[PDB]
Every structure is written in structure tokens, then in C-alpha cells.
């Protein structure tokens, strides 16, 4: 149902606010704007800072668009999901999303996948690519299939395959982790099938 989901009328701003960033579930260094549509990270030194969406998904196929300007990524820009227990702030620059049992992320600068990972040993996504041969553009789609229990991504039309599996049974929230002063990251929920 992904083709259909992506072809349907885009959710209006009220829907986007309902599924957008949660001012009550983000780093103390993040400011959520326009009722959830985007956030801005304050320029705190030696800090990685995350946000969760307001809604957690345990069933169905969900998709949302992340907008993350290329000049506002810095050393560690990670896009993915989290349980409600994943830490959203740490006092150093790192791939915080995906550093534990509670979170799954794609490093949109390096191409690596993180789950229970400190970085070393992380695989590349899409399969068989090298990070330095790709550039993740400003807009990417995040595709969470909680019927199959997969997370994957789509770019400029197009689904890149499952990145993570084994997610069925959990309740998972849109998430990112960021290190860049003043970065502005939009989440646009596209809906559920």
C-alpha cells in the first residue's frame, strides 16, 4: 500500500501538527515550532539532541517526510524511530539515535544504519552503496511498516528497501538526533494505511 499512501492527498497542517514533534518529548535544547511542524536546535556546544513525534505506531503502514537542510547537518544527523524510552540528549556529539536498544536510525551524512551501535561496524544503506557516493537530499521519506515490522526510507519517488527488521510488537515514534546549532528539521506526516 505504499504507492497508494504516497499518491493520496497530502495531510493538512492540523494532521501534521498532531503527528509532528512533541514539545513534551524532546531535548531541553530543542524548541518545537508551529505546534509540531518543525523544531530548531539551540546552539549548545558538546550536545546531541533528539525529538520524538507525538504519536507512537504499533500497527499499520506509516510514512512521513523529514526536511533537513544539507548545510545544517554537521557531524551527526540521524533519522529513524525510537521507543518512548530512548534517551533524547547526551553531552557529546554522536549518533545518539541508534546508540541503544531503544532506537533505529540512518546516518544521512554517512549512509550507515545504527541500532545498539556506537558507529563502528554499522552497515551501509542502501545495500551495497558507499556513503561518499551518495548525498541524501534535503527531503527524505521515512516508511515504517508495523505489519511486517520494518523501517525503510524513500527518496525522490522511490523506496530504497527495508533497512531494519524485527520491529513488530513495539510502539515506535518518529525520531531524529541532531548536533548542529540552529538546525531546523521539519516533519510532515503523510498518513497511515
Amino acid at each position: 500500500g505504499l504507492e497508494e499512501l504516497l499518491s493520496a492527498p497530502p495531510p493538512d497542517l492540523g494532521a501534521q501538527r498532531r503527528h509532528g514533534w512533541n514539545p513534551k518529548d524532546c531535548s531541553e535544547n530543542i524548541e518545537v515550532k508551529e505546534g509540531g511542524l518543525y523544531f530548531e536546535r539551540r546552539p549548545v556546544a558538546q550536545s546531541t539532541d533528539g525529538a520524538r513525534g507525538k504519536r507512537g505506531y504499533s500497527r499499520g503502514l506509516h510514512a512521513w517526510e523529514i526536511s533537513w537542510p544539507l548545510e545544517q547537518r554537521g557531524t551527526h544527523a540521524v533519522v529513524g524511530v525510537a521507543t518512548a524510552l530512548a534517551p533524547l540528549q547526551t553531552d557529546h556529539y554522536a549518533a545518539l539515535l541508534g546508540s541503544n536498544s531503544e532506537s533505529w536510525g540512518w546516518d544521512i551524512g554517512r549512509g550507515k544504519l545504527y541500532h545498539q551501535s556506537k558507529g563502528p561496524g554499522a552497515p551501509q544503506y542502501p545495500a551495497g552503496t558507499q556513503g561518499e557516493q551518495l548525498e541524501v537530499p534535503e527531503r527524505l521519506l521515512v516508511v515504517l511498516d508495523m505489519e511486517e515490522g520494518t523501517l525503510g526510507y524513500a527518496i525522490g519517488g522511490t523506496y530504497l528497501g527495508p533497512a531494519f527488521r524485527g520491529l513488530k510488537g513495539r510502539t515506535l515514534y518518529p525520531a531524529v538526533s541532531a548536533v548542529w546549532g540552529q538546525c531546523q528539521v521539519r516533519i510532515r506526516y503523510l498518513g497511515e494505511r
Binding site: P43, A45, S47, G74, T75, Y93, W180, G181
Partner: peptide, 9 residues
Amino acid sequence: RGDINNNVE
């Protein structure tokens, strides 16, 4: 006094 990652210095 000036950090990487566009953070305070």
C-alpha cells in the same frame, strides 16, 4: 569562544 557544529564558542 567557537565550536564546531555551529555551536557556541
